[PDB]
Write a protein that binds this ligand. Structure first.
Ligand code: CL
Ligand code: CL
Length: 162
């Protein structure tokens, strides 16, 4: 298992614009297009992202190319972030994938705000960190995906995904 297969289980793949769990226009593998209510503002972003006139539909390959950019950006954002970097550096390979996942989903700003949990991870207090992470809108809103990520943090194995 690796970050790509993990995120592909959590986000799915859709080749036509769809609305995410929060109601926003997305396409491919969890690629957020816009938070604007307009489907047109969504198709415009999409065409800008792909470099062609897509009419709201893209190929598997285009979907995978967006995914490659997004995971790459997620990693680079963590490494540029003063709050996140020290956390990531301290973690093993499995847990690192868990933090990338949260970033991909909620952005660097959002994750960076989980101050207390971050401190617990850095300290390797797994059980306490898992308990704290669960007290969040995140866990309340997408409980099944949150449990998987949380279990990856507590355990350090990919069990939740197998
Ligand atoms: Cl883009
Ligand atoms: Cl969920």
């Amino acid at each position: 298992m690796n970050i790509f297969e993990m995120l592909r289980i959590d986000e799915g793949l859709r080749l036509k614009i769809y609305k995410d769990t929060e109601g926003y226009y997305t396409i491919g593998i969890g690629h957020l297009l816009t938070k604007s209510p307009s489907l047109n503002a969504a198709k415009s972003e999409l065409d800008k992202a792909i470099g062609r006139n897509t009419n709201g539909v893209i190929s598997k390959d285009e979907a995978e190319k967006l995914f490659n950019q997004d995971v790459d950006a997620a990693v680079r954002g963590i490494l540029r972030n003063a709050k996140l970097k020290p956390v990531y550096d301290s973690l093993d390979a499995v847990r690192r994938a868990a933090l990338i996942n949260m970033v991909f989903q909620m952005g660097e700003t959002g994750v960076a705000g989980f101050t207390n949990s971050l401190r617990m991870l850095q300290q390797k207090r797994w059980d306490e960190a898992a308990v704290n992470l669960a007290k969040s809108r995140w866990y309340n809103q997408t409980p099944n995906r949150a449990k998987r990520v949380i279990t990856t943090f507590r355990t350090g194995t990919w069990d939740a995904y197998k």
